[PDB]
Amino acid sequence: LGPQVAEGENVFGVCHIFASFNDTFVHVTDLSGKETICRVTGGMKVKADRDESSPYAAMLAAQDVAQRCKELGITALHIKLRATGGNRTKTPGPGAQSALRALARSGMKIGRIEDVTPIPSDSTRRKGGRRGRRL
RNA sequence: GUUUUCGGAACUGAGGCCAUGAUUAAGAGGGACGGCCGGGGGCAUUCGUAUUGCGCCGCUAGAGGUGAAAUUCUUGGACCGG
């Protein structure tokens, strides 16, 4: 079922935290990244558009993710936090910090923390006009 | 008839005092030369992520978008991860 090898050591996964300003993704996956353990977003925890990116929704999603990973044998997590990136914003959304803190607070062990938002060497045009969005 | 040069007219064969004759080198300009310098220009040639598609590998059935006023796919698997 799970790795019951060397109970005294850590089993490491990778948590890809995608914190956009619309909602937040808490995605724990294999060490290589190909196999996924569980992905719980903030939108499957709140029934309203606005709170999809809220810190509370991210805390709930991270709690469920950590519960599933603990019941699946994974004990420690490497963090790969990303914002939307591209030509859009590079600042992580409101739920990133709360998701990370909820992962740490719910009995998970944190490994290396890395920021992986996609940064262009230079990009295509942004979705706004030349005068920007005026609201 | 014929009076060659002393107040003129052409073919110019020789030589000499010419103090023999070219201002300077613009805190003007042009040009040359020297070592550089610059996202200056043209041609060719490399590289970088990002974005968008496409093919594979893993699910709740959600993601997008705006302070909750919607359009936008779906046991045809979106978003996400590789």
Swiss-Prot record:
The keyword GTP-binding appears for this protein: no
Primary localization class, coarse: cytoplasm
Chain positions with Phosphothreonine modification: 117
GO molecular function: mRNA 5'-UTR binding; RNA binding; structural constituent of ribosome; translation regulator activity
Sequence segments annotated as region (Disordered): 115-135
Localization in the cell: Cytoplasm; Nucleus, Nucleolus
InterPro entries documented for this protein: Ribosomal_uS11, Ribosomal_uS11_CS, Ribosomal_uS11_sf
Gene Ontology terms: biological process: cytoplasmic translation; erythrocyte differentiation; maturation of SSU-rRNA; negative regulation of transcription by RNA polymerase II; ribosomal small subunit assembly; ribosomal small subunit biogenesis; translation
Position(s), cross-link Glycyl lysine isopeptide (Lys-Gly) (interchain with G-Cter in SUMO2): 45, 47, 90
Subunit structure: Component of the small ribosomal subunit. Part of the small subunit (SSU) processome, composed of more than 70 proteins and the RNA chaperone small nucleolar RNA (snoRNA) U3.
Protein's recorded name: Small ribosomal subunit protein uS11
Organism: Homo sapiens (Human)
